[PDB]
Write a structure and sequence with these properties.
This is part of a larger assembly, with chains A (275 residues) and B (48 residues). Chain A is 2% helix and 20% strand. By secondary structure, chain A is an all-beta fold. The longest helix of chain B has 13 residues. The chains are: A mainly beta (275), B mainly alpha (48). The complex binds potassium ion (2 copies) and magnesium ion (264 copies). The site of one magnesium ion has 2 residues of chain A, from loops. Chain A binds 6 RNA strands through β9, α1 and β14. Chain A: Keywords: Ribonucleoprotein, Ribosomal protein, RNA-binding, rRNA-binding.
Chain lengths: 275, 48
RNA sequence: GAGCUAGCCCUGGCCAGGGUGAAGCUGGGGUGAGACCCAGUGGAGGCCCGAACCGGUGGGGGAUGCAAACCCCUCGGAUGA
RNA sequence: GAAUGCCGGCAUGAGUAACGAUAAAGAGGGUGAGAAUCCCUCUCGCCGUAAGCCCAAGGGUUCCUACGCAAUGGUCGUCAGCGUAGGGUUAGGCGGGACCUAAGGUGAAGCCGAAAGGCGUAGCCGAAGGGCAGCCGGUUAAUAUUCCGGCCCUUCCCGCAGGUGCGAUGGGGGGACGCUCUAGGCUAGGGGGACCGGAGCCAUGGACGAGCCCGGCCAGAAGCGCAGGGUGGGAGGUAGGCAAAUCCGCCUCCCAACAAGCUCUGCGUGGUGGGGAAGCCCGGGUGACAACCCCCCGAAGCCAGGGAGCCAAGAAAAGCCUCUAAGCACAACCUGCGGGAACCCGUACCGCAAACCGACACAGGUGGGCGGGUGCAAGAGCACUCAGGCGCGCGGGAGAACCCUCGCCAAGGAACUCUGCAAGUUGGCCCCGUAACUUCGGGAGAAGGGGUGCUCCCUGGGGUGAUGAGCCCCGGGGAGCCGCAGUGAACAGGCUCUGGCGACUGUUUACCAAAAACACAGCUCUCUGCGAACUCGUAAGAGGAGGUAUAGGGAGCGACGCUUGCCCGGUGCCGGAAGGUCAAGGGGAGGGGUGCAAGCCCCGAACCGAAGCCCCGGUGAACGGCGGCCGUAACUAUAACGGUCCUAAGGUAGCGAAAUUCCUUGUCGGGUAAGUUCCGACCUGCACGAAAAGCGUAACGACCGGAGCGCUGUCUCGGCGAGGGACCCGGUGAAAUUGAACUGGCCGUGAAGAUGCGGCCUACCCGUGGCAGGACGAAAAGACCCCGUGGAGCUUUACUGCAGCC
RNA sequence: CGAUGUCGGCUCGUCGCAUCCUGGGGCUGAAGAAGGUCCCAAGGGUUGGGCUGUUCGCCCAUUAAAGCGGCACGCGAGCUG
RNA sequence: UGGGAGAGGGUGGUGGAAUUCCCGGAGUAGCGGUGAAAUGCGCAGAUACCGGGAGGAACGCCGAUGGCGAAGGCAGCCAC
RNA sequence: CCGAGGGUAGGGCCCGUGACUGGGGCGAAGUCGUAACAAGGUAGCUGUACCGGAAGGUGCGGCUGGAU
RNA sequence: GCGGGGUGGAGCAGCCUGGUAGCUCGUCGGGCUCAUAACCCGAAGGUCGUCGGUUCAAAUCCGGCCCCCGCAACCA
């Protein structure tokens, strides 16, 4: 339930912040954090390869456990639910009965102090992690491996999910957060339930400064530059696009599909995305 | 106002220094050239 | 050639003193329970006034200058992008 | 002899401007060949959150002393950051290295690239971050946490004793963390003392006083005391911490918990060791057996890794502790004590500046710490002032114009002007009081007003102390005194009404534009299923992101409210396995060259044959576009209505002479005595219109218009005054410019604007202060304009290529 | 074109006369008063405001009158911008 | 106190029929629509037919002149 | 001291008037259509929504004051 | 200054490419209806802005003229 403010400044008029109700622990597990190198959008050549980046809050990266076949059959208790500044979702702290501690992303409804588990024999229950072939049809599911033993790739952002439509051979049919129908291998692990923090998209950043805190630097329209800079540059006074609207690098940016036509995974997509 | 020369001995030596020149093809050519011309110092003097 | 300047990275430092009084919390009233109201406590903010510091709005001086951009009087921000 | 030639020399302007902050000087005495300028003394003025003091950077002998004054110093110089010489910088504890890691750099492995080279794990390097043992005083002309004195501490080696399963580059803990606000207790620092110590002083009318003036401390091991930080103890199981593990993690049981105990810091005390003023006498000596105490204010610093709240969620690695592994347990490690050992580099001086960066001893720039007192509500603000440091390296006169900076002004009060430009006014605090409108926050310091000093009397509350005295911080009431005036000096909003643009705080053309531009939260379209798209790269490799569609790229629009109409014929994009066209290649009807021939060689039609293109559809918050003529109503006028031509479809809502309106100062209304501007309406909108968004919008603005109140030297209309210049004298002494010059006016003439030619007129020679009409004055080989088959930036359905993609 | 600064304003004037006013005349469809038209005449005078960058022009309130032109659309080594 | 009827309300669950669309099959010259047509859809293989899949919405028969509620109104079935 | 009232400033209510603008009422013989009364030739009314020269039309749900 | 246009009463074809003036509405006569409109059956009306030329022949092709709408008028 997103939190509002009274309009005691201009910016507080519409600023909203998360309610943080699900959070039960406020500093990270020291043995599970490691320093996050901020890149400023610069690659190893020193060159900005992603414009408009940098200057946000310092962060510690929290090591998340996207493979859970690492510990099949060993149940864990849910020790805490904690704020992760590297992802939109909240992460859960797990104490396995082994004593090993680990981080997962916390699905919706996950209760601090409950048992979760992974493996082909796990109960169909929010937090458990089976290979896709053992999850029943019609189940909402998250943190889905794309390929077996490669890592949870799909449905990781706040509130997102994937639903199992049917099985077809060594393969199941997933409807992704995007609406596409894909064939993912049945031996790919997933996690029953949808990712938590579904209110995350109702946040109103509220003012320019809040975007600077998140590492977002101001983004200048092409239409505001000079021809040496952007297809939309120049013009006496304002100006319509005066050509098919284009990126800084020339290519059209309203409708031009950019997926590679001959990509091997095309044999595994049943329908492109909705909407 | 703030002019353009703000001396710094570490910056002077890590930029124009002897070892900075030897590490690079163009740098070795500077030394070869200043040596062939007969320069007394091949490299800025900085007191370290 | 980035010892000027523009951006980013890492690590440190700086921001006198006043002002306003958000949420919450405590109590009181209210109701079937509530919303909600009031008082206190509280100390929020690209909040208000103003040094340092950062600026450069208006005018005047300077114009073989004190200065290849300066001086004076005014003025902007000053917990923040 | 000419090239705005080149190099050098010397002229002109000229004894001219200038001599670098308007903080400020005067006298006496020294020294010396020579003194406004050096030294000393007295008087005066200036800085005092500095114009004082201490670090760092950078500079590199500039430091101290003696002897010098040719050049340097904007003058002088006997002086100096100058010349010559001699001297001077001392560390186990400060800083850095023999320690650790950050970005980044480098890089055994490995990957890539014609060559050069580019990447890259661990590792290594890399600091103003971590870690780590010295405080006070004295001494030199010049160094001092470095020498000396006192009291302390660290590491390494060896030895002795006691204890112990010892042992690491390996496991674990810890190191280890943000922003705002903040408790308790301290210290630093400061104010007072009728208490203690002090050379003295009594003036000029009074004062021998509970008088004036001066001072009243620093450091310190163990122990102890006050305040804090850190920390659970035992046991059983154990499958995780990439071998092991008694450590660590997880499970269960007992006991202990706002404690206590152990541990570690800060403060106080502490054996001792220091220091110690005015004033007088020549840096010193005395003062002096100096005294060294009480109360109060009190940190932003200390305890510290403290507490709370919040979201944007806040380094690493070593030192250190623990666990064990090989190994070894005659060893090794831990504790205590002793003797020995302890290296390299920096250390002078300047350091908001005359020694650094600006060609200069340059009104500019330069990071950190200390920064005292009184008063003004507070403070680092402001005035004065301590300690300390200075009067700015040309002076002496004079008392014009004129310029600058400043003060005042009769009556009027914006009449000035493009514009109240500028300068007035207002101004702090306390209380009274405060409108439209609003998104209910605001608008608001709205507006407007009243108070403000001194004295005596009564009195309420807090802090410390003790509950009292004293001190200290908030106040309340009554009666009075004085002046023109009580935030009596200095620092410190003029206000209101109304439009346009932009929501707002923000950002911008360093050095003519700060805005209405850029950004912005927010809205929409579109791409992207992850070895993502996209971007940089020949590549490997990176960024994206150790992210995963509530995510990331691109594009437009730009808070918010109410909204965003019609056109898919053209262009773009999306979809479309048909058909049409289509390169290499396949195919090989049919020819040709040659040879005696087998054969070798070349041409080659039908037909099969991708993408792209046509062809069929979709698509506007994609590129974009959204008509013309004619007629019609029972006064007139005007047409709801009709007719016809064209379109892909003919502009919807809402706005409108507008940042858009040409005709235009449109017409009417308001404001004014008067209104090409302004505000409100009208609508034949030259040429508004809906995300190059349409119409509004409280709040905000060093934006741009219009009005009014206040107040004024802006003005009628100027006057007087101040200081710094200008002027005169002594010293030092430029500049651009310059064909040569013995360089007048008129009317003509002339390459059409004449000091220089003609005619007339006028004028004795040479300067000084002034003014700017001319010398088509100076400056800059016109930016405008053209010319050149000159150049460069930019665009596209110009040509032709290329990367990239298919 | 190896530069002749370009509107207007301010300041400061100076000249011409095709005379706005003031002085002198003739004619009048001049009764007086006040006008009209032409002649002579350049000595002096020729206001303050609203609007607009404006020159000009309109408007307010006066006036004896509110003249028209030249001087590089007089005058930026005199100012403004 | 003991009992009864009920589409009374709220939550969660779930059952078949149908329409649309998508993929496979088989199949060809029209489908659709109307007063009649036309637009439209269809040899780029539609309509009609079978099998599979996705998704949303509404509950046929019972059903009544019926029942419940204060009204607005409440209908597959199941539990609370 | 209080004190008629005077003066500066800011509010509230009423009244009059105002370029222009909105619908309303009325007016012997105006222009356009034909919405309603018959099933008024699409049954009518209705709350709301959007649209359109105009009456109106259409969507959603409601009423019989609906005919056969 | 560059461009397009002028033809029955209204709005438009024919002009390029010489010989043939056409379409919708309107107007006139009749029909239907009680009557009007709509509707049905028929008819008239254009010497093609103008003067001049080319030609056997000019709406048509070429000139001058009148007109009626447009696009433009920039560097100072
Ligand atoms: K030009
Ligand atoms: K010229
Ligand atoms: Mg809010
Ligand atoms: Mg939460
Ligand atoms: Mg760590
Ligand atoms: Mg990264
Ligand atoms: Mg590089
Ligand atoms: Mg980018
Ligand atoms: Mg970037
Ligand atoms: Mg999170
Ligand atoms: Mg995420
Ligand atoms: Mg798969
Ligand atoms: Mg969002
Ligand atoms: Mg961030
Ligand atoms: Mg932008
Ligand atoms: Mg632009
Ligand atoms: Mg631009
Ligand atoms: Mg560029
Ligand atoms: Mg371009
Ligand atoms: Mg463009
Ligand atoms: Mg532009
Ligand atoms: Mg532009
Ligand atoms: Mg434009
Ligand atoms: Mg556009
Ligand atoms: Mg255009
Ligand atoms: Mg265009
Ligand atoms: Mg383009
Ligand atoms: Mg591309
Ligand atoms: Mg897809
Ligand atoms: Mg600078
Ligand atoms: Mg620098
Ligand atoms: Mg350095
Ligand atoms: Mg350094
Ligand atoms: Mg450096
Ligand atoms: Mg640097
Ligand atoms: Mg380098
Ligand atoms: Mg080097
Ligand atoms: Mg070499
Ligand atoms: Mg040299
Ligand atoms: Mg040599
Ligand atoms: Mg070199
Ligand atoms: Mg630097
Ligand atoms: Mg501050
Ligand atoms: Mg206040
Ligand atoms: Mg309060
Ligand atoms: Mg609280
Ligand atoms: Mg602020
Ligand atoms: Mg402010
Ligand atoms: Mg204030
Ligand atoms: Mg300035
Ligand atoms: Mg001013
Ligand atoms: Mg200059
Ligand atoms: Mg200045
Ligand atoms: Mg000032
Ligand atoms: Mg200010
Ligand atoms: Mg401020
Ligand atoms: Mg402040
Ligand atoms: Mg010659
Ligand atoms: Mg030359
Ligand atoms: Mg020369
Ligand atoms: Mg020479
Ligand atoms: Mg010579
Ligand atoms: Mg010479
Ligand atoms: Mg000479
Ligand atoms: Mg001379
Ligand atoms: Mg001279
Ligand atoms: Mg002179
Ligand atoms: Mg000079
Ligand atoms: Mg000077
Ligand atoms: Mg000064
Ligand atoms: Mg001064
Ligand atoms: Mg002063
Ligand atoms: Mg004297
Ligand atoms: Mg001498
Ligand atoms: Mg002297
Ligand atoms: Mg002398
Ligand atoms: Mg002096
Ligand atoms: Mg002296
Ligand atoms: Mg002071
Ligand atoms: Mg000074
Ligand atoms: Mg130097
Ligand atoms: Mg000398
Ligand atoms: Mg001498
Ligand atoms: Mg000598
Ligand atoms: Mg000299
Ligand atoms: Mg000298
Ligand atoms: Mg000098
Ligand atoms: Mg001398
Ligand atoms: Mg020395
Ligand atoms: Mg020592
Ligand atoms: Mg050694
Ligand atoms: Mg190291
Ligand atoms: Mg390398
Ligand atoms: Mg090489
Ligand atoms: Mg190499
Ligand atoms: Mg290095
Ligand atoms: Mg190192
Ligand atoms: Mg260090
Ligand atoms: Mg040390
Ligand atoms: Mg010590
Ligand atoms: Mg000392
Ligand atoms: Mg051990
Ligand atoms: Mg170890
Ligand atoms: Mg930690
Ligand atoms: Mg941490
Ligand atoms: Mg740190
Ligand atoms: Mg915060
Ligand atoms: Mg102390
Ligand atoms: Mg004090
Ligand atoms: Mg287990
Ligand atoms: Mg003694
Ligand atoms: Mg501080
Ligand atoms: Mg602390
Ligand atoms: Mg804490
Ligand atoms: Mg690291
Ligand atoms: Mg062994
Ligand atoms: Mg042994
Ligand atoms: Mg031991
Ligand atoms: Mg050594
Ligand atoms: Mg030293
Ligand atoms: Mg110093
Ligand atoms: Mg300074
Ligand atoms: Mg400093
Ligand atoms: Mg100094
Ligand atoms: Mg000095
Ligand atoms: Mg120097
Ligand atoms: Mg300079
Ligand atoms: Mg000086
Ligand atoms: Mg200086
Ligand atoms: Mg003091
Ligand atoms: Mg104060
Ligand atoms: Mg000094
Ligand atoms: Mg004089
Ligand atoms: Mg005064
Ligand atoms: Mg006056
Ligand atoms: Mg006035
Ligand atoms: Mg007045
Ligand atoms: Mg005015
Ligand atoms: Mg202006
Ligand atoms: Mg002003
Ligand atoms: Mg009002
Ligand atoms: Mg108002
Ligand atoms: Mg309000
Ligand atoms: Mg107030
Ligand atoms: Mg007030
Ligand atoms: Mg206001
Ligand atoms: Mg009073
Ligand atoms: Mg007094
Ligand atoms: Mg003041
Ligand atoms: Mg103020
Ligand atoms: Mg306007
Ligand atoms: Mg703005
Ligand atoms: Mg706007
Ligand atoms: Mg806006
Ligand atoms: Mg904005
Ligand atoms: Mg701000
Ligand atoms: Mg600029
Ligand atoms: Mg510029
Ligand atoms: Mg510049
Ligand atoms: Mg520049
Ligand atoms: Mg400027
Ligand atoms: Mg600008
Ligand atoms: Mg500004
Ligand atoms: Mg918006
Ligand atoms: Mg590239
Ligand atoms: Mg590439
Ligand atoms: Mg990564
Ligand atoms: Mg923008
Ligand atoms: Mg639109
Ligand atoms: Mg279209
Ligand atoms: Mg189309
Ligand atoms: Mg299209
Ligand atoms: Mg053959
Ligand atoms: Mg093809
Ligand atoms: Mg178009
Ligand atoms: Mg267009
Ligand atoms: Mg009529
Ligand atoms: Mg509309
Ligand atoms: Mg208009
Ligand atoms: Mg107007
Ligand atoms: Mg407008
Ligand atoms: Mg405009
Ligand atoms: Mg317009
Ligand atoms: Mg015009
Ligand atoms: Mg106009
Ligand atoms: Mg005009
Ligand atoms: Mg007018
Ligand atoms: Mg009109
Ligand atoms: Mg507004
Ligand atoms: Mg507003
Ligand atoms: Mg602003
Ligand atoms: Mg502004
Ligand atoms: Mg104004
Ligand atoms: Mg005004
Ligand atoms: Mg004056
Ligand atoms: Mg004077
Ligand atoms: Mg004289
Ligand atoms: Mg000299
Ligand atoms: Mg010269
Ligand atoms: Mg001569
Ligand atoms: Mg002469
Ligand atoms: Mg003469
Ligand atoms: Mg001539
Ligand atoms: Mg002449
Ligand atoms: Mg002559
Ligand atoms: Mg001559
Ligand atoms: Mg002659
Ligand atoms: Mg002559
Ligand atoms: Mg002559
Ligand atoms: Mg004469
Ligand atoms: Mg003169
Ligand atoms: Mg002159
Ligand atoms: Mg002049
Ligand atoms: Mg001249
Ligand atoms: Mg001149
Ligand atoms: Mg040249
Ligand atoms: Mg030239
Ligand atoms: Mg030229
Ligand atoms: Mg030039
Ligand atoms: Mg030209
Ligand atoms: Mg050519
Ligand atoms: Mg040529
Ligand atoms: Mg060319
Ligand atoms: Mg260029
Ligand atoms: Mg070129
Ligand atoms: Mg010249
Ligand atoms: Mg010139
Ligand atoms: Mg004037
Ligand atoms: Mg007369
Ligand atoms: Mg007569
Ligand atoms: Mg008469
Ligand atoms: Mg006259
Ligand atoms: Mg005018
Ligand atoms: Mg003119
Ligand atoms: Mg005019
Ligand atoms: Mg008269
Ligand atoms: Mg004139
Ligand atoms: Mg001229
Ligand atoms: Mg001139
Ligand atoms: Mg002229
Ligand atoms: Mg000028
Ligand atoms: Mg001028
Ligand atoms: Mg002029
Ligand atoms: Mg001149
Ligand atoms: Mg201008
Ligand atoms: Mg200006
Ligand atoms: Mg067909
Ligand atoms: Mg076929
Ligand atoms: Mg769907
Ligand atoms: Mg009274
Ligand atoms: Mg009275
Ligand atoms: Mg009254
Ligand atoms: Mg009807
Ligand atoms: Mg009907
Ligand atoms: Mg009908
Ligand atoms: Mg009807
Ligand atoms: Mg309709
Ligand atoms: Mg006609
Ligand atoms: Mg036609
Ligand atoms: Mg034709
Ligand atoms: Mg023909
Ligand atoms: Mg009839
Ligand atoms: Mg003819
Ligand atoms: Mg003929
Ligand atoms: Mg041009
Ligand atoms: Mg011009």
């Amino acid at each position: 339930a997103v939190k509002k403010f009274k309009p005691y400044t201009p910016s507080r008029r519409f600023m909203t912040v998360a309610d943080f109700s699900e959070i039960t622990k406020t500093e990270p597990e020291k043995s599970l954090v490691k320093p996050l190198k901020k890149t400023g959008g610069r690659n190893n050549q020193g060159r900005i390869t992603v414009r408009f980046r940098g200057g946000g809050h310092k962060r510690l990266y929290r090591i998340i456990d996207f493979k859970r076949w690492d510990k099949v059959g060993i149940p864990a208790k849910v020790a805490a639910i904690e704020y992760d500044p590297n992802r939109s979702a909240r992460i859960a702290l797990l104490h396995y009965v082994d004593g090993e501690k680990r981080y997962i992303i916390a699905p919706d409804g996950l209760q601090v102090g409950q048992q979760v588990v992974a493996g082909p024999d796990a109960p169909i229950q929010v937090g458990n992690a089976l290979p896709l072939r053992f999850i029943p049809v019609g189940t909402v599911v998250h943190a889905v491996e794309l390929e077996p033993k490669k890592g949870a790739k799909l449905a990781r952002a706040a509130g997102t999910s994937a639903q199992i439509q049917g099985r077809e051979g060594d393969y199941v049919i997933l409807r992704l957060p995007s609406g596409e129908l894909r064939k993912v291998h049945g031996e790919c692990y997933a996690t029953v339930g949808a990712v938590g923090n579904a209110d995350h998209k109702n946040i109103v950043l509220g003012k320019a400064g809040r975007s600077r805190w998140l590492g977002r630097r101001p983004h200048v329209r092409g239409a505001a530059m000079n021809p040496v800079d952007h297809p939309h540059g120049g013009g006496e006074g304002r100006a319509p696009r005066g050509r098919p609207p284009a990126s800084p690098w020339g290519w059209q940016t309203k409708g031009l599909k950019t997926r590679k036509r001959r990509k091997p995974s095309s044999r595994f997509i049943i329908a492109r995305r909705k909407k | 106002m703030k002019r353009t020369w703000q001396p710094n001995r570490r910056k002077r030596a890590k930029t124009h220094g002897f070892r900075a020149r030897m590490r690079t093809p163009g740098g070795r050519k500077v030394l070869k050239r200043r040596r062939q011309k007969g320069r007394w110092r091949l490299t800025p003097a900085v007191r370290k």
